[PDB]
């Protein structure tokens, strides 16, 4: 318990060195080959790429300067990159390279071939409590680290957790990540995962991440989220309402834990109490979990997705291949000066 505190301490120091003095233009477009698109986003897409000098595969994130701009996501894009190049945690996707060009922003990360948890979750339906618990444990720890650096993640969902070769998770998409001492007020996240304080425009803190966990956990063990409907509006209504129904297969410990994460009253919510994280690590639901073991990647994973070979894309869905178009004249230069 003190070992943790001390860990965190050195870790904050490392982060700060990088937070105050970031990396810029460490690669070029040409140094890679575009293999396949792995996902599409709002302002960009993700592609499997291949580094010519080393023959290593990576996932390259590509953001359109112009769309980031019209969508007023400028600050958010700067944050994502600035933060990603500074963290280092076993369950965080590693940023290798970063660069930009006349029309785009690029973030090159390592490739995690197991695909999104979302695909498995959906295909299988739901996970057994022990299975989900395995995952939760990793996110608790990840949040423990992140929150320590005065960071809020803000975009927890199955779509964002990737599964590696060992069956361990990797958190991707820091598009909403923000370093903040104090409150923030941006309306952002994914409907089914938004805390009421966000929805209510109340000004929020890192406690929103904990409500998110609650949702994650419920979703994985039930196979469906606690609050769903066909139009966001309908969802917002159920979130703030305060009602939550659980499946009859939930263990009582589970129901207890989720009843605490899904606390509308920020003043009662687990994780945002004096004792923070400990209120969670100590719960009966996780009585079996050896935090240290998880951290160390010593625990045997419930499911390992088998990799056919390096560069294999079998675990991702297919998307139409647009082609990377690179302008002759620079787009939004001053806006992305620090990238």
């Amino acid at each position: 318990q003190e070992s943790v505190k001390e860990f965190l301490a050195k870790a904050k120091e490392d982060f700060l060195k990088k937070w105050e003095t970031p990396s810029q233009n460490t690669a070029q477009l040409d140094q890679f080959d575009r293999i396949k698109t792995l996902g599409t986003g709002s302002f960009g897409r993700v592609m499997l790429v291949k580094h010519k000098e080393s023959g290593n595969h990576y996932a390259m994130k590509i953001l359109d300067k112009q769309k980031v701009v019209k969508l007023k996501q400028i600050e958010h894009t700067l944050n994502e990159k600035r933060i990603l190049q500074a963290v280092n945690f076993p369950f965080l996707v590693k940023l290798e390279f970063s660069f930009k060009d006349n029309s785009n922003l690029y973030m090159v990360m390592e490739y995690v071939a197991g695909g999104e948890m979302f695909s498995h979750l959906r295909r299988i339906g739901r996970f057994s409590e022990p299975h989900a618990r395995f995952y939760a444990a990793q996110i608790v720890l990840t949040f423990e680290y992140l929150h320590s650096l005065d960071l809020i993640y803000r975009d927890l969902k199955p779509e964002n957790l990737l599964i590696d070769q060992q069956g361990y998770i990797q958190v991707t998409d820091f598009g909403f990540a923000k370093r903040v001492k104090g409150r923030t007020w941006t309306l952002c996240g994914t409907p089914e995962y938004l805390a009421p304080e966000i929805i209510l425009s109340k000004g929020y803190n890192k406690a929103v991440d904990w409500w998110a966990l609650g949702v994650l956990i419920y979703e994985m063990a039930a196979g469906y989220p606690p609050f769903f409907a066909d139009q966001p509006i309908q969802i917002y209504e159920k979130i703030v309402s305060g009602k939550v129904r659980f499946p009859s297969h939930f263990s009582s410990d589970l129901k207890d834990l989720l009843r605490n994460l899904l606390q509308v009253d920020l003043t009662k919510r687990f994780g945002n109490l004096k004792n923070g994280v400990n209120d969670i690590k100590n719960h009966k639901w996780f009585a079996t979990t050896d935090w240290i073991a998880i951290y160390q990647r010593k625990v045997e994973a419930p499911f390992i997705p088998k990799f056919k070979g390096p560069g294999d894309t079998s675990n991702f869905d297919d998307y139409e291949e647009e082609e990377i178009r690179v302008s002759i004249n620079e787009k939004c230069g001053k806006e992305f000066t620090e990238f």
Partner: peptide
Amino acid sequence: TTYADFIASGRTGRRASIHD
């Protein structure tokens, strides 16, 4: 069943993140 309700819902796929 709720599970069935979920399945026939419109939000069974990948959810996009909101902003403003």
